[PDB]
Amino acid sequence: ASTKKLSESLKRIGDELDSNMELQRMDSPREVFFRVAADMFSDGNFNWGRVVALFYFASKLV
Amino acid sequence: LSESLKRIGDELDSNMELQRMIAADSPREVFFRVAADMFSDGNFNWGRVVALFYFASKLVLKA
Amino acid sequence: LGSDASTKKLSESLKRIGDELDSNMELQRMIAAVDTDSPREVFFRVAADMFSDGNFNWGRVVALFYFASKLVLKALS
Amino acid sequence: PLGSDASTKKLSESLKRIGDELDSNMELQRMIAAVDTDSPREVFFRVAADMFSDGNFNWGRVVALFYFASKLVLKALS
Amino acid sequence: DASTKKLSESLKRIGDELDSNMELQRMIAAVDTPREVFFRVAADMFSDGNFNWGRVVALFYFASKLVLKA
Amino acid sequence: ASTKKLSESLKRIGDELDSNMELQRMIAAVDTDSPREVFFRVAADMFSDGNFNWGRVVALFYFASKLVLKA
Ligand SMILES: CCCCCCCCCCCC
Ligand SMILES: O=P(O)(O)OC[C@@H](O)CO
Ligand SMILES: CCCCCCCCC
Ligand SMILES: CCCCCCCC
Predict the structure, then answer these.
(1) CATH 3.40.50.960 corresponds to the domain A2-61
(2) Is E11 within 8 Å of F63 when comparing Cβ atoms?
(3) How deeply is E43 buried, as exposed, middle or buried, from its count of CB atoms within 10 A (0-12, 13-18, 19+)?
(4) Ligand 4 neighbourhood includes D33 CB (under 6 angstroms)
(5) Which of A4, A15, A17 to mutate to test the interface with B (most CBs of B within 10 A)?
(6) Which among D20, D35, D50, D53 is the top mutation candidate for probing chain C, defined by the most C β-carbons within 10 Å of its own β-carbon?
(7) Residue A40 needs a FRET pair 20 to 30 A away by CA distance; which of A56, B22, C58, E7 works?
(8) Alpha-carbon distance C18 to C65, whole Å?
(9) Do F37 and D49 touch (CB under 8 A)?
(10) What is the distance in angstroms between the Cα of D11 and the nearest Cα belonging to chain F?
């Protein structure tokens, strides 16, 4: 029950990110990444979850 | 999109139950058990992969 | 441009290991036969089996990395 | 529900056998343990330079060099 | 084989100029114990909107020395 | 603030790298049909002396990464 309560949480978070935001929204890879990254951190909040979402976004374009 | 990656990472950062469940040893064995239970069904959507990476990246900071 | 008894012997063994990986015909056939349907399920099935016995050593990580990188290239074309 | 996948099992069983030969090759681990614990960047370069001295840059060699690199980073870490 | 000599000699001087820049080494060493000063420098590096690749490598040079101290 | 001086030095270094026309000229003159062999021959020549300082690895990463864009 220990690992099961944690995996169902991440599984619940993962599917709700996949169904809420119409993702897979995707000319020049480097520019547009730094374009959204500058807009992600216009407010000086560099929280860790923002880097993780920005990490996957960078690997998507490659 | 810029606000999409923002609120996605923010709500994942603010889930008090998730941050409490992550705080609950031997990191690699639990990560393998968590990853095996996450994809016990047959869907490997990006959100689960990101949430597993977010769990792994948080799991390596404690070690 | 420089060697030693130990480093030269170490280099030839790593070179022999890497060459036997790429020339293992049966290994290359199994890798080339993976489905382009979902390489994620294949990668998960492989990783789950490689760490099912509760044992984790870096040779298996390295072998999983060799397959994952080849799986990425085949799924690109 | 993930059921069976016999062809993937043949592959994962082979990769698992390959990774265990690397970890249990006592001749390889002896050579890895017996390289200078002083300048790990230097010995890594000389190994890499000799591995690709012949014009062959196949991916299996890169992975074998990455394996030696990964073990090299751990020895200098402990 | 000689065309390599000029290029490798320039990259060699670039790397040595980086590590032997005493003012730069002092500034990198004067940081505090973590991941947030990296973003403070990063957002300060790209505030003019220029994301040319040389700046990313220069930031990688700082981050790698920053992560070694950790 | 305190990081302002360091941020301007890294930004200056990055701008000097990309604007070094003689360096960009040499990187652009690399054989596109064998970028791997050119890289190894440059890397072996860079460390032909006994020095393996981290700055040289970063410079090698700059040349290698620019090599991957053309490839
Ligand atoms: C004491 C020097 C730091 C230890 C680094 C060892 C890593 C060697 C492998 C290099 C791979 C790029
Ligand atoms: O020759 P292989 O082993 O396929 O690797 C080549 C790859 O590194 C780029 O083409
Ligand atoms: C112990 C199995 C870990 C496998 C990671 C799951 C990633 C699949 C996309
Ligand atoms: C050849 C890969 C060098 C990176 C070493 C990483 C060690 C874990």
Answers:
(1) no
(2) yes
(3) middle
(4) no
(5) A17
(6) D50
(7) B22
(8) 13
(9) no
(10) 30
Resolution (A): 2.2
Give yes or no for a contact between C38 and B44, defined as CB atoms under 8 angstroms apart.
Answer: yes
Residues 6+ apart with CB under 8 A from C63: C50, D15, D16, D18, D19, D22
**What is the spatial distance between Cα A15 and Cα A4, in angstroms, rounded to a whole number?**
16
The tokens for D48 are: 């890499």
Q: Which chains sit next to D, with 3 or more Cβ pairs under 8 A?
A: B, C, F
CA of D59 to the centre of ligand 2 (A): 5
Nearest to C43 by CA among C67, C59, C73: C67
Indicate the residue type of D8: T
End-to-end CA distance of chain C: 38
Interval between CA A43 and ligand 1 midpoint (Å): 37
D21 and C27 in contact (C-beta within 8 Å)? no
Using CA of residue C32, residue C36, residue C40, residue C45, what is the dihedral sign? Answer: negative
Residue pair E54/F14 in contact (Cβ under 8 Å)? The answer is yes
Q: In one letter, which amino acid is A29?
A: P
Domain B25-63 fold: Apoptosis Regulator Bcl-x (1.10.437)
What is the helix (H) or strand (E) element at residue C40, kind and residue range?
helix C39-50
Q: What is the chain A residue with the closest CA to E42? A: A38
Q: What experimental approach yielded this model?
A: X-ray
Residues just before a chain gap in chain D (C–N exceeding 2.5 Å) are none
A10 close to B38: Cβ distance less than 8 angstroms: yes
Determine contact, residues C62/D22, Cβ cutoff 8 Å.
yes
Amino acid, single-letter form, for residue F52? F
CB neighbours of residue F62 within 10 Å = 25
Residue A25 to residue C6: CA distance in whole angstroms? 53
3 state SS of F35: helix
Cβ–ligand 4 distance for D73 under 6 Å, the answer: yes
Ligand 1: which atom is nearest the Cα of residue D76?
4
How close does chain A come to B23, measured CA to CA in Å? 10
Other C-beta atoms closer than 10 Å to the C-beta of A9 total 20
B20 contact partners, CB below 8 Å, separation of at least 6:
none
**Domain over F3-70 is classified CATH 1.10.468.10:** no
How many Å lie between the centroid of ligand 2 and the Cα of residue D16? 23
